[PDB]
Design a protein around this ligand. Structure first.
Ligand code: GTB
Ligand code: GTB
Lengths: 209, 209
């Protein structure tokens, strides 16, 4: 510490880590970068890959949203209790990323014509997560193990944004519906989901949701 | 152990882990699944996400190529010496994945028309890796730290396949050119790169390279 998040004035690839820090009683400094500030002309600070977000933990600067999640997962003890749980948590997080990549592609490159085809193929992509829950204590606890991990926060966010995209996409998935209701019920998270800084902030950076 | 890899008869998303195991004196069992075997019916829905590869370490089954790399990175001690190096190794591996995703998109969905545009934008994507090397002992050692990690194996593979795609794409990058020559010089890897099981195996699953 201290923690600092540099990103656009949207949820996107930072709402997951913002939920993690908030649930673990942590506090961070929000540093906004408008699209005007980003793209305008000759301006280049030191963006490794040229994109955002950028995280700062004490005197450690990091890039890549998932690399940041795994960092907080190691330092804050949210990466399982053994090798098996660690590997399974990566397998799950990667699956979440694959679907998140598709969602981003839809919103930014083919929202109008692709929406119908996306929502139609969606139940096929959400099914694996449903299967994972049943295999672990009947989906009573978390995606992997007994305690909450970084994978749970990323998965929760993926499902929350898909409920806005497709209103009843979880109806055919009992476990996933209860899983979202359960994790949202947690006092720390609930406070965040009902916070002005979260509500007033749009999901994506183009008005499409 | 024992180690087992289930995948298509191509390099693709498994040549990196095959180099890692080979360099660490490990031995695995190769289990091939033809495209014909893929299209069947009842004997098919057994894959978590519905894709490959599938790795087996003793009595631990895993999916997602990157999750498998990180697993071998923890058990075989190829994940750095501290938190900083671990986070930086993830940041690098994720960058490699982003470019690998683009490469796969080109080869399978737009090889004919997209090739020229890809090769033209390529030097902009390889630049970050060049910058990383100079920042670490002038690119004398490895991508991160003093010892070889899983990130190095994945990066080496990404560059090797891009040299086939675009013959002189590394000419403008001194450090990356020496980095590939150095890691390829390693006796264990060199033996693998000159092995029949590797040579006779095509890079992608559609004849395009
Ligand atoms: N693999 C990377 C991808 C990072 C990424 O997508 N970065 C985007 C922001 S997320 C998507 C996004 C982009 C822009 C806005 N906006 O409001 O302007 C909102 C959301 C970016 O920097 N875009 C600008 C650029 O490429 O130069 C990661 O996970 O960190
Ligand atoms: N994010 C995942 C992606 C896995 C993946 O790309 N799986 C592909 C194989 S790699 C690319 C590939 C595909 C097919 C062949 N082939 O010879 O038929 C070769 C390579 C697959 O299962 N494709 C079939 C399907 O989607 O059902 C990971 O890294 O594991």
């Amino acid at each position: 510490p201290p923690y600092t998040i540099v990103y656009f004035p949207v949820r996107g690839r930072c709402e997951a880590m913002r939920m993690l820090l908030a649930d673990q009683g942590q506090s961070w400094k929000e540093e906004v970068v408008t699209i005007d500030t980003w793209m305008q002309g000759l301006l280049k600070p030191t963006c490794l890959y040229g994109q955002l977000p950028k995280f700062e933990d004490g005197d450690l600067t990091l890039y890549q949203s998932n690399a940041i999640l795994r960092h907080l997962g190691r330092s804050l003890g949210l990466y399982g209790k053994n090798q098996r749980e660690a590997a399974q948590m990566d397998m799950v997080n990667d699956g979440v990323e694959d679907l998140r990549g598709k969602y981003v592609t839809l919103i930014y490159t083919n929202y109008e014509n692709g929406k119908n085809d996306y929502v139609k193929a969606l139940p096929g992509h959400l099914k694996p997560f449903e299967t994972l829950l049943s295999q672990n204590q009947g989906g009573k606890a978390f995606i992997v193990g007994d305690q909450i991990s970084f994978a749970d926060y990323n998965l929760l966010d993926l499902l929350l944004i898909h409920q806005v995209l497709a209103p009843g996409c979880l109806d055919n998935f009992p476990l996933l519906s209860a899983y979202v209701a359960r994790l949202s019920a947690r006092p720390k998270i609930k406070a965040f989901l009902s916070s002005p800084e979260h509500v007033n902030r749009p999901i994506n950076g183009n008005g499409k949701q």
